[PDB]
Amino acid sequence: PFVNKQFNYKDPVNGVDIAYIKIPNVGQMQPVKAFKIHNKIWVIPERDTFTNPEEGDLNPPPEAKQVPVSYYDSTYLSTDNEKDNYLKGVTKLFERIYSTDLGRMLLTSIVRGIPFWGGSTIDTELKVIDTNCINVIQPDGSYRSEELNLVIIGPSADIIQFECKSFGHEVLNLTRNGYGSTQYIRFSPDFTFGFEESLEVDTNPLLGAGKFATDPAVTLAHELIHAGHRLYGIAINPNRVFKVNTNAYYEMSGLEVSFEELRTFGGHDAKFIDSLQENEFRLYYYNKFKDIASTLNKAKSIVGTTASLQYMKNVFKEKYLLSEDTSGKFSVDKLKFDKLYKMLTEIYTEDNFVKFFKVLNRKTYLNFDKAVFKINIVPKVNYTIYDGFNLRNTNLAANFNGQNTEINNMNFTKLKNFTGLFEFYKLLCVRNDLCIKVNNWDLFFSPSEDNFTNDLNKGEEITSDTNIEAAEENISLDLIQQYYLTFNFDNEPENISIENLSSDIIGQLELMPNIERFPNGKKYELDKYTMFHYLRAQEFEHGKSRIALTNSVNEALLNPSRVYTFFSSDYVKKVNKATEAAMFLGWVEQLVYDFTDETSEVSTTDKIADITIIIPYIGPALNIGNMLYKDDFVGALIFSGAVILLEFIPEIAIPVLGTFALVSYIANKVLTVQTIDNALSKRNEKWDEVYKYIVTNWLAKVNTQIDLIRKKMKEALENQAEATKAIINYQYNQYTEEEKNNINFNIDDLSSKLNESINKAMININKFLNQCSVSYLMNSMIPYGVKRLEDFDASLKDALLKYIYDNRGTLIGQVDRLKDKVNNTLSTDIPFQLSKYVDNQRLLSTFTEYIKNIINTSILNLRYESNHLIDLSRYASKINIGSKVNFDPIDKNQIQLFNLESSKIEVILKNAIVYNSMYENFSTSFWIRIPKYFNSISLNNEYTIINCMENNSGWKVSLNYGEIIWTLQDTQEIKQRVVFKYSQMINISDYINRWIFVTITNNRLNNSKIYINGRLIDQKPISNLGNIHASNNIMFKLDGCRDTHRYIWIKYFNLFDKELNEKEIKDLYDNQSNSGILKDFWGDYLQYDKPYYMLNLYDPNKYVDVNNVGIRGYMYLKGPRGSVMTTNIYLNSSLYRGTKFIIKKYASGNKDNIVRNNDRVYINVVVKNKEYRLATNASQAGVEKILSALEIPDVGNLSQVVVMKSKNDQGITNKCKMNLQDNNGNDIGFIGFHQFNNIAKLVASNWYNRQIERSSRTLGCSWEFIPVDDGWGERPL
Ligand SMILES: [Zn+2]
């Protein structure tokens, strides 16, 4: 820390702060020269050759060590100059770490570390473990033993294998028992690791060229965070490793990250460790301190120094944060411990440092390094204490340029890795065997199910004084700030003179676990091609080959010029074809555009709330479609969901949650009323444990894969930009030889381009990916955990209601409100807040937009997507469709069901995901289309359409002559039904043979409500209905319809696990109305080329008629619209009356024949088997324009274009649908009628236009198109 005096290697040895140290090693050891950069921190610029006897050889091994990176140089750090530079650098980084709030705290705990005084000399005595000091040679040839705390030596054989090294004890775990021991950090500030980014692009649009460098400060900070854990004897056993599955062509051959490694990194990595294992360690170390206090509390004397036993007892007092009374006895304050621990453990972590140093760095310990570099930090022009490489001013500070080894090329010297490229690998063969050498450190992670401990099954007794939950403070920069203020920076252990030790202190390193070499080669003969194969087929041989030509098909990896793409053929074409230099730059522009073009394709799929943004070429870039129902990725993903992306499917074991036992209290109100609260509280806490648990499983099994792909794609895109830089190149590589011609093709600028083109591409691919992650979590992992909680919740309620009962008379004036409190709480879940377990601004931001759409909420949502009737909410397991089930050809999401026992659709919901307390509070909605009842059979005959019962298992939708019903019924067969009844004796009905939006709400504690088209039609209490069954499957089929020609049309069926409120209902309702598409009088999309009868909503008793064809003729509303009937059944005004209307395309045609909100069209009037053209003369007299049916060829420049409408300019629905316009583009007006001497001719008046803005009064322009429909038995006269 800080380091007071600036050293030089040659500066004269002086017995203190600069001496000839004799580290505690084995056997003899010529003394070595080390400096004292600070109280308790020495620096030896030698290669660690002393610490380990079996490590004096600094030469590389004929066999390679299984690590992604390695580097050797027998000669490094030999000269006396190299030492000085090493001295100058190790320092500058301590100053770097020290210049940060987080840094500052850590170096104060490290210097304060001080290995406990074990040396167990007689219980009651204190003493120094000689292995924690060093002998210091004084000038007069003498030597005085000195206590040490942390030492930095040079690397051993493998220069970049930095790590913590401590000497062990004959019978003590000085690193895992609380004692702590002097640490020797093998580190070098002359080499670094290069890594690659594929996320920061979101915040940095012009992110660096390629591989970035790792600020040496972080690496050193990472290693100290380790000395910290060990100094406080809190290091996790290195026998604790996150097990990894290896047998599989996609799995990593070998790799064993330690918990103490996932701990030290922090970020999410540290979240891979389950809660149960987390608290396992805490108590473990919390008891190591308790013994430290005991050990101290009974220490009478102290052999060794001339320092007061009190002084000593105090150092360790101030170290472990012990508390002592007036007698001087020590104790471990639990609450004060949890803090110290929380600091050494979660505040001081690599991720947290990457915040203080504002540098770019790996975002996970599982992001394997791909390089080594020779850097030189000493010169200020290169690296500064405050800015590092990203120097102030210098063009390095805009986008971590200083860290980009390509941009800041001058500061990084690419060295030779010593692990080839295929040292550790896997052999993957297709089905010409067709195999590939896939790199080990290039395959999937894949955690073993073992790692995830749990313990969620243990039940629990709930007394009155149980201890309630505790937050999950995500360690925000604010919390660190707090720790900083309350941080104690004054006073640092004194250099307590100890009595000389052996001239040669006997060492022997702590024993690390053995390196189990892993198998290599391992062959894999597969069926389908792999994402690895496809990726492979996009690299192509360096360059001395023949001008390669891009070419689809995986066989694109059989020719020496093996290259493949996922781009449109035309690109292949433009690239694969000679281009005369006369015309070359054009080509460049072309490709670039086309590249940045093909590379940015994004599907909106708005009609799919869940995964919005979509990058289609992913499927054919990594062969992700996983081969399903043949191609069409964007359709593939929609049919399955983000599952189609996982190289492997993770499971979720959420045991049958235990239960709370309730300790009862005899005639003790307080103590009782307090137990129920503890019960409910622990239950709330109970839900948190489950959620937090699946987020750990989701963080390592799922989210990790998606991230590998995230890299894979970024890899792909570059493989493409690299070839289109090869091809284009080969061309100009055979240039005309004419200088001054073109400001150079600038390969180092076409690239500056292709860079951006890809950087943005990743911004899209990333959003898309983030959605498949969050989304996969919400519909494939949470539902499971919830089921068990909801169960637990359903149980606890009884156990609680009973408790209250069994204790009434003691809960005298409260046996109701407590009965209400327990019934009111345990009647709704505990929302899943992702922010409670994740800081990631990326994913939370995602999670937020996902939550906004109430549809992603539904436990069942089935639309007709792509080419299937699927359950987008991923709850259904098998949706069996009948044979007599028909799907409207236009909007196939409109299902029609007949009376035939062969037309039916049955849906079964995954059992594991279904809890029986599921239909207490829940809603259901769908769109209905009921034909008209013509016969009398229909009378008093109630057929059922939707049924969900398991022997009296409530709710099933039924129909009966002019009314819709919803009946709830419990096992105790008690039933309750709510009904909406619609009369069939009306001129014009709002429900007959039309579409009706229906929503049914259910609140166990209240009533059952029925909403028709948004408004509440009726409600009936249900606070008396007993328990209800949860049917595993729902059946769509009519049942008991005596009518032979009865049928219905359903649409947008959904099922919600909560009581939708008025607002939600109305929102949901406006959303499923497709306001951008005009409608049939019955609700279907209006259509081009399809004769409709006009019904004027203002004067429903008349009907359009063409007085006389021609401009000298007119159209008007004719006399009395006839009636229709069938005594004792219906009496509706007739519809199929008057002249028909035909809408003709005019703007954007050939496409679907659906008429959309703002289409310009043509209205052909069909007069006497012939079709004419409704037009007018915009040069008439008044505001009104009479309109006539002209001869299509005689119309000419007369006003005829009509702008169809559906949403008022303001945005409100209006019936006024036809706005006529003059060719100049003007606005002649909406079409309506108008009295002209008691004749009311159809007219286009600019009046309505004005009114439609103000009010919303049904006007003379309120038209309605009526096609003939099998639902309206009426016969077109
Ligand atoms: Zn480490």
Side-chain angles (χ1 to χ4, degrees), residues 1078-1079 1086-1092 1094 1140-1146 1153-1155 1159-1166 1171 1173 1202 1204 1217-1218 1265:
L1078 279 78
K1079 305 297 161 39
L1086 192 75
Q1087 291 176 69
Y1088 286 102
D1089 312 316
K1090 178 171 179 304
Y1092 295 108
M1094 300 308 94
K1140 291 184 175 185
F1141 263 45
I1142 285 174
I1143 303 181
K1144 319 302 302 184
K1145 272 189 170 180
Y1146 165 71
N1153 294 298
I1154 288 181
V1155 182
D1159 308 334
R1160 272 183 296 165
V1161 306
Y1162 278 167
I1163 299 291
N1164 284 335
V1165 177
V1166 187
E1171 276 171 48
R1173 174 136 297 159
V1202 158
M1204 296 310 282
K1217 288 187 299 311
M1218 306 176 294
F1265 290 64

Coordinates of all heavy atoms in Angstrom, one line a residue, residues 1078-1079 1086-1092 1094 1140-1146 1153-1155 1159-1166 1171 1173 1202 1204 1217-1218 1265:
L1078 N -60.0 -3.4 -40.5 CA -61.5 -3.2 -40.5 C -62.2 -4.5 -40.2 O -61.7 -5.5 -40.3 CB -61.9 -2.5 -41.8 CG -61.7 -1.0 -41.9 CD1 -60.2 -0.6 -42.1 CD2 -62.5 -0.3 -42.9
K1079 N -63.5 -4.4 -40.0 CA -64.3 -5.6 -39.7 C -65.6 -5.9 -40.3 O -66.3 -5.0 -40.9 CB -64.5 -5.7 -38.1 CG -63.2 -5.6 -37.3 CD -62.3 -6.8 -37.6 CE -60.9 -6.5 -37.2 NZ -61.0 -5.7 -35.9
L1086 N -62.4 -7.2 -42.7 CA -63.1 -6.8 -43.9 C -62.2 -7.3 -45.1 O -61.0 -7.5 -44.9 CB -63.2 -5.2 -44.0 CG -64.1 -4.7 -45.1 CD1 -65.5 -4.8 -44.6 CD2 -63.8 -3.2 -45.3
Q1087 N -62.7 -7.5 -46.3 CA -61.9 -8.0 -47.4 C -62.1 -7.5 -48.8 O -63.2 -7.0 -49.1 CB -62.1 -9.5 -47.4 CG -61.5 -10.3 -46.3 CD -61.9 -11.8 -46.4 OE1 -61.4 -12.5 -47.3 NE2 -62.7 -12.2 -45.5
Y1088 N -61.1 -7.5 -49.6 CA -61.1 -7.1 -50.9 C -61.8 -8.1 -51.8 O -61.7 -9.3 -51.5 CB -59.7 -6.9 -51.4 CG -59.0 -5.6 -50.9 CD1 -58.1 -5.7 -49.9 CD2 -59.4 -4.4 -51.4 CE1 -57.5 -4.6 -49.3 CE2 -58.8 -3.2 -50.9 CZ -57.9 -3.3 -49.8 OH -57.3 -2.2 -49.3
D1089 N -62.5 -7.7 -52.8 CA -63.3 -8.5 -53.7 C -64.2 -9.5 -53.0 O -64.0 -10.7 -53.0 CB -62.3 -9.3 -54.6 CG -61.2 -8.5 -55.2 OD1 -61.5 -7.4 -55.7 OD2 -60.1 -9.0 -55.2
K1090 N -65.2 -8.9 -52.2 CA -66.1 -9.7 -51.5 C -67.4 -9.0 -51.2 O -67.5 -8.3 -50.1 CB -65.5 -10.2 -50.2 CG -66.4 -11.0 -49.3 CD -65.6 -11.7 -48.2 CE -66.5 -12.5 -47.3 NZ -67.6 -11.6 -46.8
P1091 N -68.4 -9.0 -52.1 CA -69.7 -8.3 -51.9 C -70.3 -8.3 -50.5 O -70.5 -9.4 -50.0 CB -70.6 -9.0 -52.9 CG -70.0 -10.4 -52.9 CD -68.5 -10.1 -53.0
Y1092 N -70.6 -7.1 -50.0 CA -71.2 -6.9 -48.7 C -72.4 -6.0 -48.9 O -72.5 -5.2 -49.7 CB -70.2 -6.2 -47.8 CG -68.9 -6.8 -47.4 CD1 -67.7 -6.4 -47.9 CD2 -68.9 -7.9 -46.5 CE1 -66.5 -7.0 -47.5 CE2 -67.8 -8.5 -46.1 CZ -66.6 -8.0 -46.6 OH -65.4 -8.6 -46.1
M1094 N -74.7 -3.1 -47.4 CA -74.5 -1.9 -46.5 C -75.6 -1.7 -45.5 O -76.8 -1.7 -45.9 CB -74.3 -0.6 -47.3 CG -73.1 -0.7 -48.3 SD -71.6 -1.1 -47.4 CE -71.6 -2.9 -47.8
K1140 N -75.3 -4.4 -53.3 CA -74.1 -4.8 -52.7 C -72.9 -3.9 -53.0 O -72.9 -3.2 -54.0 CB -73.7 -6.2 -53.2 CG -74.6 -7.3 -52.6 CD -74.1 -8.7 -53.1 CE -74.9 -9.8 -52.4 NZ -74.4 -11.2 -52.8
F1141 N -71.9 -3.9 -52.1 CA -70.7 -3.1 -52.2 C -69.5 -4.0 -52.4 O -69.3 -5.0 -51.7 CB -70.5 -2.3 -50.9 CG -71.0 -0.9 -51.1 CD1 -72.2 -0.6 -51.7 CD2 -70.3 0.2 -50.6 CE1 -72.7 0.7 -51.8 CE2 -70.7 1.5 -50.7 CZ -72.0 1.8 -51.3
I1142 N -68.6 -3.6 -53.2 CA -67.3 -4.4 -53.5 C -66.1 -3.5 -53.4 O -66.0 -2.6 -54.2 CB -67.4 -5.1 -54.8 CG1 -68.4 -6.3 -54.7 CG2 -66.0 -5.6 -55.2 CD1 -68.6 -7.1 -55.9
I1143 N -65.2 -3.8 -52.4 CA -64.0 -3.1 -52.2 C -62.9 -3.6 -53.1 O -62.5 -4.8 -53.1 CB -63.5 -3.1 -50.8 CG1 -64.7 -2.6 -49.9 CG2 -62.3 -2.3 -50.6 CD1 -64.3 -2.6 -48.4
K1144 N -62.3 -2.7 -54.0 CA -61.2 -3.0 -54.9 C -59.9 -2.4 -54.5 O -59.8 -1.2 -54.1 CB -61.6 -2.4 -56.3 CG -63.0 -2.6 -56.6 CD -63.4 -4.1 -56.6 CE -62.5 -4.8 -57.5 NZ -63.0 -6.3 -57.6
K1145 N -58.8 -3.2 -54.6 CA -57.5 -2.8 -54.2 C -57.1 -1.6 -55.0 O -57.6 -1.3 -56.1 CB -56.5 -3.9 -54.3 CG -56.4 -4.8 -53.1 CD -55.2 -5.8 -53.2 CE -55.0 -6.5 -51.8 NZ -53.8 -7.4 -51.9
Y1146 N -56.1 -0.9 -54.6 CA -55.6 0.3 -55.3 C -54.2 0.7 -54.7 O -53.4 1.3 -55.5 CB -56.5 1.4 -55.1 CG -56.0 2.8 -55.4 CD1 -55.7 3.1 -56.8 CD2 -55.7 3.7 -54.5 CE1 -55.2 4.4 -57.1 CE2 -55.2 5.0 -54.8 CZ -54.9 5.3 -56.1 OH -54.4 6.5 -56.4
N1153 N -55.7 -10.3 -48.8 CA -56.9 -9.5 -49.2 C -57.7 -9.0 -48.0 O -58.9 -8.8 -48.0 CB -57.9 -10.4 -50.0 CG -57.3 -10.7 -51.4 OD1 -57.0 -9.9 -52.2 ND2 -57.1 -12.0 -51.6
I1154 N -56.9 -8.6 -46.9 CA -57.5 -8.1 -45.7 C -57.4 -6.5 -45.8 O -56.4 -6.0 -46.3 CB -56.7 -8.4 -44.4 CG1 -57.0 -9.9 -44.1 CG2 -57.1 -7.6 -43.3 CD1 -56.2 -10.3 -42.9
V1155 N -58.5 -5.9 -45.5 CA -58.5 -4.4 -45.6 C -58.0 -3.8 -44.3 O -58.5 -4.1 -43.2 CB -59.9 -3.8 -45.9 CG1 -59.8 -2.3 -46.0 CG2 -60.4 -4.5 -47.2
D1159 N -56.0 2.0 -45.9 CA -55.8 1.7 -47.3 C -56.6 2.5 -48.2 O -57.7 2.9 -47.9 CB -56.2 0.2 -47.6 CG -55.5 -0.8 -46.7 OD1 -54.4 -0.5 -46.1 OD2 -56.1 -1.9 -46.5
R1160 N -56.0 2.9 -49.3 CA -56.8 3.7 -50.3 C -57.4 2.6 -51.1 O -56.7 1.6 -51.5 CB -55.8 4.6 -51.2 CG -55.5 5.9 -50.6 CD -54.6 6.8 -51.5 NE -53.3 6.1 -51.7 CZ -52.5 6.5 -52.6 NH1 -52.8 7.4 -53.5 NH2 -51.3 5.9 -52.7
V1161 N -58.7 2.7 -51.4 CA -59.4 1.7 -52.2 C -60.3 2.2 -53.2 O -60.3 3.4 -53.6 CB -60.2 0.8 -51.2 CG1 -59.3 0.3 -50.1 CG2 -61.3 1.7 -50.6
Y1162 N -61.1 1.3 -53.7 CA -62.1 1.5 -54.7 C -63.4 0.8 -54.3 O -63.4 -0.3 -53.7 CB -61.7 1.0 -56.1 CG -60.8 1.9 -56.9 CD1 -60.1 1.4 -58.0 CD2 -60.6 3.2 -56.5 CE1 -59.3 2.2 -58.7 CE2 -59.7 4.0 -57.2 CZ -59.1 3.5 -58.3 OH -58.3 4.4 -59.0
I1163 N -64.6 1.5 -54.5 CA -65.8 0.9 -54.1 C -66.6 0.6 -55.4 O -67.1 1.6 -56.0 CB -66.6 1.8 -53.2 CG1 -65.9 2.0 -51.9 CG2 -68.0 1.1 -52.9 CD1 -65.7 0.8 -51.0
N1164 N -66.8 -0.6 -55.7 CA -67.6 -0.9 -56.9 C -69.0 -1.2 -56.4 O -69.1 -2.0 -55.5 CB -67.1 -2.2 -57.6 CG -65.8 -1.9 -58.4 OD1 -65.6 -0.8 -58.8 ND2 -65.0 -3.0 -58.6
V1165 N -70.0 -0.6 -57.0 CA -71.4 -0.9 -56.7 C -71.9 -1.8 -57.7 O -71.8 -1.6 -58.9 CB -72.2 0.4 -56.8 CG1 -73.6 0.1 -56.4 CG2 -71.7 1.4 -55.8
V1166 N -72.5 -3.0 -57.2 CA -73.0 -4.0 -58.1 C -74.4 -3.7 -58.5 O -75.3 -3.9 -57.6 CB -72.9 -5.3 -57.5 CG1 -73.3 -6.4 -58.5 CG2 -71.5 -5.6 -57.0
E1171 N -71.1 -4.4 -62.4 CA -70.4 -3.6 -61.4 C -70.0 -2.3 -61.9 O -69.5 -2.1 -63.0 CB -69.1 -4.3 -61.0 CG -69.2 -5.4 -60.0 CD -67.9 -6.2 -59.8 OE1 -66.8 -5.6 -59.8 OE2 -68.0 -7.5 -59.8
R1173 N -68.8 2.0 -60.7 CA -67.9 2.7 -59.8 C -68.5 3.9 -59.1 O -68.8 4.9 -59.7 CB -66.7 3.1 -60.6 CG -65.7 4.0 -59.9 CD -64.3 3.5 -60.2 NE -64.2 2.1 -59.7 CZ -63.3 1.3 -60.2 NH1 -62.4 1.7 -61.1 NH2 -63.2 0.0 -59.7
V1202 N -61.3 6.0 -52.1 CA -61.8 6.1 -50.8 C -60.8 5.6 -49.8 O -60.2 4.5 -50.0 CB -63.1 5.3 -50.6 CG1 -63.4 5.0 -49.2 CG2 -64.3 6.1 -51.2
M1204 N -60.1 3.9 -46.6 CA -60.8 3.1 -45.5 C -60.3 3.5 -44.2 O -59.2 4.0 -44.0 CB -60.5 1.6 -45.8 CG -61.0 1.1 -47.1 SD -62.8 1.5 -47.3 CE -63.5 0.3 -46.2
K1217 N -66.4 4.7 -41.8 CA -65.3 4.0 -42.5 C -64.9 4.4 -43.8 O -63.8 4.0 -44.3 CB -65.7 2.5 -42.5 CG -65.6 1.8 -41.1 CD -65.8 0.3 -41.2 CE -67.1 0.0 -41.8 NZ -68.1 0.8 -41.0
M1218 N -65.7 5.2 -44.5 CA -65.3 5.6 -45.9 C -65.1 7.0 -46.1 O -66.1 7.8 -46.1 CB -66.3 5.0 -46.9 CG -66.5 3.5 -46.8 SD -67.8 3.0 -47.9 CE -69.2 3.8 -47.3
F1265 N -70.4 -3.2 -43.0 CA -70.5 -4.1 -44.2 C -71.0 -5.5 -43.8 O -70.6 -6.1 -42.8 CB -69.1 -4.3 -44.8 CG -68.6 -3.1 -45.5 CD1 -68.4 -1.9 -44.8 CD2 -68.4 -3.1 -46.9 CE1 -67.9 -0.8 -45.5 CE2 -67.9 -2.0 -47.5 CZ -67.7 -0.8 -46.8

